[PDB]
Amino acid sequence: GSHSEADNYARELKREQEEIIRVPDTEAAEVAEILARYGIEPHEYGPVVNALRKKPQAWLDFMMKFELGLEK
Amino acid sequence: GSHSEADNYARELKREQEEIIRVPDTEAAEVAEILARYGIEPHEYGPVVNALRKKPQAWLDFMMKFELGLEKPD
Ligand SMILES: [Cl-]
Numbered sequence: 001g002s003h004s005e006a007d008n009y010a011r012e013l014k015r016e017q018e019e020i021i022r023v024p025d026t027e028a029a030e031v032a033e034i035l036a037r038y039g040i041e042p043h044e045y046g047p048v049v050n051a052l053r054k055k056p057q058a059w060l061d062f063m064m065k066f067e068l069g070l071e072k
Numbered sequence: 073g074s075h076s077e078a079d080n081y082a083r084e085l086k087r088e089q090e091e092i093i094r095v096p097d098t099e100a101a102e103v104a105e106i107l108a109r110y111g112i113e114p115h116e117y118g119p120v121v122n123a124l125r126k127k128p129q130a131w132l133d134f135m136m137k138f139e140l141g142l143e144k145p146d
Pocket residue numbers: 054055056057058
């Protein structure tokens with residue numbers, strides 16, 4: 001049967017959301033490590049990682065785009 | 073025929089470095105716009121911009137990824 005472009009993204013969205021709920025500090029470490037790739041130091045990237053944790057839907061969007069390479 | 077021309081990556085990498093040299097303030101403003109989409113505030117991303125500016129090679133790869141959706145190979 002079908003494979004909706006909608007369905008693939010909802011499949012990938014669901015998996016990532018469940019990781020944020022079950023292992024949030026691990027997901028926060030994924031952000032830190034992406035930003036550290038560009039020689040940004042913890043004292044510099046820290047507040048961005050903290051800003052995302054406080055906005056779970058934005059944090060989920062950020063992972064979808066910058067960890068998984070996906071768009072809406 | 074078979075294709076060998078400098079790919080989208082090669083061309084955008086050329087274009088993106090020239091911007092960084094010629095209109096760095098404009099490329100800094102692009103990072104602010106990108107991180108602001110995810111609810112981040114200037115006092116939060118300001119230090120990240122400031123660090124990217126001091127590291128031209130890091131900054132180029134940042135823009136390739138966060139602006140243009142392209143990974144650095146290998
Ligand atoms: Cl939110």
